[PDB]
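Batch queue: ligand-bound targets. Current item pairs a single chain with XNI. No template structures supplied; prediction is de novo from sequence plus SMILES. Inputs echoed for audit trail.
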Amino acid sequence: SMSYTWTGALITPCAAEESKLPINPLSNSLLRHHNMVYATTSRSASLRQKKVTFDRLQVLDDHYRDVLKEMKAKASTVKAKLLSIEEACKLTPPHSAKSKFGYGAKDVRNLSSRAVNHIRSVWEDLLEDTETPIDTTIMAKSEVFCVQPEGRKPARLIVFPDLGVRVCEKMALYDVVSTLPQAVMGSSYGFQYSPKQRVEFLVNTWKSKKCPMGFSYDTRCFDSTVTESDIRVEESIYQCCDLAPEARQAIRSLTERLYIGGPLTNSKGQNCGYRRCRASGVLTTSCGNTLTCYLKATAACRAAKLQDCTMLVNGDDLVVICESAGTQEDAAALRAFTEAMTRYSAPPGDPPQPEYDLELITSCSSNVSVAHDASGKRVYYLTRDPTTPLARAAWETARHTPINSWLGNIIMYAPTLWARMILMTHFFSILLAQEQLEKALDCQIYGACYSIEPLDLPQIIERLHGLSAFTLHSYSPGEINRVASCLRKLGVPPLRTWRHRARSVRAKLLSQGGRAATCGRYLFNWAVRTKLKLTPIPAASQLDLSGWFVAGYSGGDIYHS
Ligand SMILES: CC(=O)N1c2ccccc2NC2=C(C(=O)CC(C)(C)C2)[C@@H]1c1ccc(OCc2ccccc2)c(Cl)c1
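Prediction returned. Tokens below.
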């Protein structure tokens, strides 16, 4: 069976799509090579459609079944609650795609009599109807990138059900999908970790091995490799939770009717094809992908007889650290592993490379690098090639986009050379210039959408990274060469120029006192020679990030207000 069948109807946009970076005074001071920056559109959808459509091979074995039972054993631990319509709506992001049935996200959030009635009827139909496939829209996602060294990416696709359904998924599954991965995978579940916690875990795992070997594994179009069996097995795990009767039935109907496959419709309302694999835009895609990657990966480790495997799983991204048996025997073990995964229907994009320095391993586009704090002590932190973040920064500088990936990157990659000298300097300079310092902004962390105030960045950074994040220096030469190389490529002024801009911006922040001066002091301490003494922020210890690093939610339509 094929991941997709198509009718021949086009994947259509519903608004004019922009694709080239505008020529803007502001984004041009960040990034001069504007023709290198682009956004994907509907126009490239048929290339993706080809790429994402293939037949699937899946043969299961005892290792797989053994691991499944063990996962289910842990699942059986879990009790899960139905959300009320109220809670479910409050998790709806304000600009979520409006229902086809005469109400939108703002009406859902207000608990408008119309929206809520529609939701209740959707819910009842979920209890009453087991079999009727639920409709989904398919859309070309618009993401921005930098052009490949030699050529472009075609748009990614997003498959989502009507708003009314999305709300009913939250009611049935929000507590499950955000409690159960932890219960099952334990320390292997990556979305439980803040940035410093992920680092502690990777370094500690690495340091705990007599002789560590590690690799990342990258299955191509993970979503299209997920089969109906996979999605049903994923359901068998959810059914181990203590569930209210209505949620048990709702998950069962949602599984047959939605998760397992269904019909696709384009913005024009046209039958477009049929999906027989994971939908990218539902509440369970993050969790399901995590359980599924975990289940197969664990089974494959056993298949390859890898020793003392520790893995970290976040949706489809997967990293394994384990005991090196020797170069030859590690190389042969990885290939065995890959062929095991391939049989479970998770073949690799590129074959995994056994790796013997932690810094060389890369997952979620990020690697571990070293720097030194104030005392000179070695500090590990997560970083990445900054090209895509930077190109997106230029884009978002020239366009009011609904999500500010620049804000997210500052939060997630705060200790990096490039986030501190470029993102902060650029964006605080702009925001100062436009009186926008106190204006809250949307970004998303691990899928979930958050409204954040720029002036709160120093406390958030403290909590997510520690004080260390404000004092790192003596980055690794390879990291500096990567960042420097990247700027030449993109036409971003050199780091030397950003220090000069930072010094200026820092002054202006200190001028303003209060929360703005806090930013100047902590965020830009790197910019001045006569550094200020930096101590814990009172407001950081205090305030509240309960929902931040609990679970993955990408595609799930989640907003934490
Ligand atoms: C699709 C998605 O939501 N993620 C994602 C996955 C894969 C590639 C690139 C990404 N992009 C981003 C993620 C964010 O949250 C926000 C940010 C604007 C950054 C972009 C998130 C992510 C990024 C890194 C991740 O691990 C590494 C890591 C973790 C913590 C601190 C630093 C680094 C994990 Cl698990 C998820």
